[PDB]
Amino acid sequence: EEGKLVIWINGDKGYNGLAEVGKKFEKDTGIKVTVEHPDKLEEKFPQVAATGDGPDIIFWAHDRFGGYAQSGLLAEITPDKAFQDKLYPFTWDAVRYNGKLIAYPIAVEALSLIYNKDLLPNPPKTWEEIPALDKELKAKGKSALMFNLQEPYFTWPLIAADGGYAFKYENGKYDIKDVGVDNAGAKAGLTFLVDLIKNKHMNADTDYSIAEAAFNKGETAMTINGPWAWSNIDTSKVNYGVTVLPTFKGQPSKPFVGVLSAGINAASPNKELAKEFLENYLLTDEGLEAVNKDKPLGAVALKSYEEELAKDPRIAATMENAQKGEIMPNIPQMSAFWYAVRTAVINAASGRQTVDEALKDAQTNSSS
Amino acid sequence: APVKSQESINQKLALVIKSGKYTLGYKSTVKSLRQGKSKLIIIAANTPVLRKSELEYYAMLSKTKVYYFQGGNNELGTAVGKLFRVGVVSILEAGDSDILTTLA
Ligand SMILES: OC[C@H]1O[C@H](O[C@H]2[C@H](O)[C@@H](O)[C@@H](O[C@H]3[C@H](O)[C@@H](O)[C@@H](O[C@H]4[C@H](O)[C@@H](O)[C@@H](O)O[C@@H]4CO)O[C@@H]3CO)O[C@@H]2CO)[C@H](O)[C@@H](O)[C@@H]1O
């Protein structure tokens, strides 16, 4: 309907904060803004947008937009140079597809190691020392590590550490034929993960909820998560620290860097109102603060505000891990990649398959 | 996939109007659907008052493909302008147009 903006953003982000920015927008223009956080919104958007339905604005990490752009579901955005200059060129490149800007960049995200300082005055610098650390903590009724094992996003950093990668980036272009989830590096990483579970250091059923509850309750000494999680830890009054992910085989864990982006529905009858909202309301120091105060965005795309927050050691750790990882590709095949890697990790973790077998199939399924 | 230019849709539509068979609007379209004569229906998602759900319901029961045009009334060609104006266009015969093999 014309005269109102409907926004879709993931449930782990600051949707209440975004609703604040929308409430302001409404007062100033009289246009009602509604924020929703449906589940699997990134799978639903392509389905409902393709039929003239769906939100006016969709929020998600940049990796999903190439797919949307290719299916002509996104309205091309065209900020004038004055606005483009307000944001970092790295974030704009993330939302550029086929040489066309397809969404607005918001913030840069990367996973970090989060630890309980009272339980671990000194967190491990390597993955290898985690088993011994766990045996010690189990002796006290605690566990060393717990993080979401259901989403490949979280395990990928370890898998990429010694060699894994999605698509070979050959001089400005990705080769959808050269996939690196099958190489020896990736196998080492995943094997190390499987063994942790085999040796009872971790449980294959652990999801985002299980892990977040255990950490925030001081049951486990460490977790792995993004900026959005800091907010709940703060309320839990757990004395935590945010730092570099532990190495593996003397090499840095390589998390996939994501840029939270906002795309405008091509079928939206409010493209102008949407751009007005994103450019002059959300991507301002006041807009981002509203959202950030709810759930941290990480390293925002707006130069002015990222500078105001750059001193936060948690952001520093975020950018440090981000600098060590790779920015996710945004091409259509990424979905296939993620789906493929998800199955591989879940199968190897539960034993349904062997590391080799699992990665062998993901390798095939990715480039499929 | 709605991966086509408004300029392209308008050109394909103009060709059907020029050399094929088609209906315009709710009434003639569901009739073409109920009769199983429609080969495709195109819906201008953003047309003012549109019985979108009902049209989609009829396309489903008649097993007829539907293509959605996403543009607004602004900057429209002749054919697409009619489309946007009547909300729905049902293609009964493509004629010299390739609309059926490129949109359905
Ligand atoms: O996992 C939470 C964090 O996820 C983010 O990293 C994301 C990528 O940006 C995604 O594009 C993505 O790939 C996903 C894909 O997008 C989607 O189809 C998804 O489908 C799941 C669904 O999430 C869930 O409901 C479940 O039931 O299963 C579906 C199919 O298995 O899954 C792909 C891979 O699982 O995923 C990664 C994470 O793997 C993001 O950037 C972070 O900010 C976010 O916190």
Structure characterization notes:
The complex is a heterodimer of chains A (368) and B (104). Chain A is of the alpha/beta class and 368 residues long. Chain A has 2 domains: 3-109 and 258-329, D-Maltodextrin-Binding Protein, domain 2; 110-257 and 330-368, D-Maltodextrin-Binding Protein, domain 2 (3-Layer(aba) Sandwich), CATH 3.40.190.10. Helix content of chain A is 43%, strand content 19%. Chain A contains 16 helices and 15 strands. Chain A has helices spanning 15-29, 41-49, 65-70, 81-84, 89-94, 130-138, 152-161, 184-198, 208-216, 230-235, 271-282, 285-294, 303-309, 313-324, 334-350, 355-366, and strands spanning 4-8, 32-36, 57-61, 96-97, 100-101, 104-109, 112-116, 143-145, 165-170, 173-180, 220-225, 240-243, 256-264, 299-300, 326-327. In chain A, the strands form 4 sheets. In chain A, strands 1, 2, 3, 6, 13, 14 and 15 form a 7-stranded mixed beta sheet that branches. A 4-stranded mixed beta sheet of chain A has the order 8-11-7-12. In chain A, a hairpin with a 2-residue loop joins strand 4 (96-97) and strand 5 (100-101). Chain B is an alpha+beta fold and 104 residues long. Chain B has a single domain (1-104), classed as Ribosomal protein L30/S12 (60s Ribosomal Protein L30, Chain: A, 2-Layer Sandwich). Helix content of chain B is 46%, strand content 18%. Chain B is built from 5 helices and 4 strands, in the order αβαβαβαβα. Chain B has helices spanning 6-19, 25-34, 52-61, 78-86, 99-103; strands spanning 21-24, 40-44, 66-69, 88-93. Chain B has a 4-stranded mixed beta sheet, sandwiched between helices. In chain B, helix 2 (25-34) runs parallel beside helix 3 (52-61). Chain B is globular, with a radius of gyration of 12 Å. Chain A binds chain B through residues 50-53, 70-73, 266-267, 269, and chain B through 1-4, 43, 45-46, 52, 56, 66, 68, 70, 72. Bound molecules: a molecule of 4 linked components (GLC-GLC-GLC-GLC). A molecule of 4 linked components (GLC-GLC-GLC-GLC) is lined by residues 12, 39-40, 42-43, 61, 63-64, 109, 151-153, 226, 258, 335, 338-339, 342 of chain A. The PDB classes it as sugar binding protein/ribosome. The entry lists the keywords structural flexibility, ribosomal protein L30, MBP-L30 fusion protein, sugar binding protein-ribosome complex. It forms a dimeric assembly.
